[model samples]
Target chain A: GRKKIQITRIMDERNRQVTFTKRKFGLMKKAYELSVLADAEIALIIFNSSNKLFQYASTDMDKVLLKYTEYNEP
Target chain B: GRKKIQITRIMDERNRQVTFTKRKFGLMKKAYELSVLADAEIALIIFNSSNKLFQYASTDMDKVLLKYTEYNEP
Candidate 1:
């Protein structure tokens, strides 16, 4: 079976907000699950279509972000 | 007038992949603009319906993810 998640239009602000909250929690849970099940370092950053921010990480975020920036830099 | 961008349903696998790249870039640009214009920090992670990933952050992503987890912690 093909892997696809179908999303209809996010038309209403209230409905979109609810979807954002639910999916945000779901993504956070997935990140935690990744860390717990796979022994992997995990971090996630999310912004709603409204542009509000959400973030999740398995360890001290500052260190992880610093390392990430360093690794991503030229 | 309401802001809406209507993209037709992506049917072809290759075409959908192309649209995904372009639309994800558009999302990243929009996120950067929101951060700049609104004096906000933003981070975004997108998993395509097929589960491929794309992300952008105006600040360190780990910091944002950490903050989200902190806020959601019970």
Candidate 2:
């Protein structure tokens, strides 16, 4: 059974990491589905407070990144 | 009231676009929540079938992108 929780930072370390990992998986899943359903390209990058890299890329990661930076080059 | 829908590419042009927009909003919403709740930094880029860009960044978009590419540098 799931319960609604506030979106603010989870105060407990264990629960925060727990929620982060779960939601991380959920986010990646949606990212995958979104890319397919929309026939789109996407790159998602997450760096937790611990500074770990977690990511999902639809299509080639480099390809998406290049497309991104091309438009944002400054 | 809502009903479950298959994750496959939605077939109808109108419904496909409809679902895409709805889920796009959901994905972005979760991106925001995950960033705050997990004390994470995120950069998400989306390019639809039309190649239109939609993005969300929990912090300075450039800062996050630069951080990502630094380790990814070839």
Candidate 3:
């Protein structure tokens, strides 16, 4: 069984990078499942320490994000 | 421990709703951990089948989502 660590900022550069990759993958997998299983709309965006981009959307990112912002605005 | 279930469309309405809540929680947890542990920025948005909204952001949602959209623009 994997031991869970305290949720705190990782100080080491290498460790931070590894954690980013692992957790990003986990988040995306769960997002995919929720979208399909529940027939929901989802959008996610992440930027690494170096400002690299990563994203996921159940449908088209642009359309979904546009709809998200539009739906949220008063 | 959990049993691995096939990743397919969930047909039952109640079951789909339950799965949505459970997986949405899991996804948000992973996103939060990734942002902190990796010193990254994250934004996530979801709409349920009923068009209900749920979201999580590592920092301010407006700022992060704006940055996300800006960075991705051509």
Candidate 4:
């Protein structure tokens, strides 16, 4: 019970938005699960075609992001 | 057909590790799909059990993170 989809940008606006909503929620759920099951730290950021922002963090969002920034910088 | 699992820290060390690997890969796959199908921008970061870093970006990693930083900051 699966439809194999190629990894490419979708052309249809309607289909794309539907897939976006579903996959966005799916990704966030997986993030939450991975953090709990693996005892990991995670931060996810997303910007949609309309430039809407979405995010999730296992710890405090600001704290995790600040940590990443420090680590990434030097 | 899916096994419904409660969202909690998995108890068995081996089981937890196995699930972690599978879910981590699954999460990244979903991220890639969302970005392409929805034509969105995304950045994902993870620090695993031992603080190992894992990441994915729809565009350039640095650019995406930098863009998020700018957008997130005042």
Candidate 5:
């Protein structure tokens, strides 16, 4: 069961890693659902403490990144 | 109360956008907590159906993105 926990930074390395894995998965799942339910284009990128890359895109990532680049053009 | 919802694509435009708003906030909250608890660097980017940008980063986004680029380099 999900339990309420304090929001401060965790200090223990093993616990931190475990929590990271759990919440990263949760965040990614919600991101996926949000894009589908909203019919919205989305892109997500994450790098863990270990410098690992994780990414998600509702459409082709190249398309999404290109859109973002275009949107930010002045 | 949170009710279980189907995982398939949502059909209504208004409902979809509303859900996207709620879930996007929730996802960002979780991402913030995860980064803190894990002492992990993180970055996130999102574009709504309207091409609106929403983002969150645990640290300097430039640093995280630069790190990501470095990791992917051959």
Candidate 6:
């Protein structure tokens, strides 16, 4: 969630990387809770700031993706 | 969120990137629910295997990060 608070302009890769690390997990944890509490189908795919593949899904991602594609394609 | 499994080392970057996209959305679908139910502030950021950026935030990520920084910085 972006906000309207002006802070220092960011430029450092290392600092950005660190922020990404913390933020990614923060995001994933929320995803987990949503699935557990809301009983909604959810999934997430992420490549780290370093471009490493990291992702998660509540149900079979392949199946979900197939359905997603089907929904959009038709 | 990632699982612990070792079967094959996928070398196709595009396939991996595709997988990342599929999973990222899966996660966000869930995150939205969790935020509504748990009243928790959550945010996520991702850099794909291609180094492209992706993100989600249930609340103001900037505010959350600012709090996180304030918590850990001191």
Model 2, which residues run further than 4 Å from truth?
A49-52
Better of 2 and 4 by TM-score: 2
Number of the candidate with higher TM-score, 2 or 6: 2
**Tens digits of lDDT, candidate 5, A1-74:** 38888887667767767877887776778767777676566566776656557777777566644555565579
Estimate the TM-score of every prediction: 0.42, 0.82, 0.78, 0.77, 0.77, 0.43
**Could you tell me the lDDT of residue A4 within candidate 2?**
85
TM-score of model 4's chain A:
0.74
All candidates in order of DockQ, best leading: 2, 3, 4, 5, 1, 6
Question: What tens-digit string does per-residue lDDT give for candidate 1 at B4-70?
Answer: 5233444565755664555455545555644443324456554445545555676766565466657
Write the residue-wise lDDT of candidate 6 on B6-41 in tens digits: 333235655544544565566556455444433344
CA shift of A20, model 2, Å: 0.9
Question: How well docked is model 4, in DockQ terms?
Answer: 0.70
**Candidate 4 residue lDDT tens string, B1-74:** 16988777778888778787777766777767777676667778776665577777777667765676787788
In candidate 4, what are the lDDT values of residues A37-66, reduced to their tens digit? 776677787776665777778766677567
What is the C-alpha DockQ of each candidate? 0.07, 0.74, 0.74, 0.70, 0.67, 0.03
Q: Estimate, for each residue in A12-36, the C-alpha lDDT of model 2 and write its tens digit.
A: 9888899888877778778887878
What tens-digit string does per-residue lDDT give for candidate 3 at A2-64? 777877876887776777778766667777767767656778776666656777787667775
Please report how far candidate 2 places residue A71 from its true position, in Å: 3.0
TM-score of predicted structure 3, chain A: 0.68
How much is A63 displaced in model 4, in angstroms? 4.4
CAPRI-style grade of the A/B interface in model 4 = medium
Query: How many Å off is the CA of A9 in candidate 2?
Result: 1.0
Point out the higher-scoring one by DockQ: 1 or 2.
2
The prediction achieving the highest TM-score against the true structure is 2
In model 1, the clashing pairs are A55-B64, A55-B65, A56-B65
User: Which is the winner by lDDT between candidate 2 and candidate 5?
Assistant: 2
Poorest stretch of ten by lDDT in candidate 5 chain A: A63-72
TM-score of chain B of each: 0.61, 0.72, 0.68, 0.75, 0.73, 0.59
The list of candidate 4 runs beyond 4 A from truth reads: A70-74, B71-74
> Which candidate achieves the best DockQ against the true structure?
2
The runs of at least 3 residues in candidate 5 whose Cα sits more than 4 Å from the true structure, single-residue gaps closed, are A70-74, B64-74
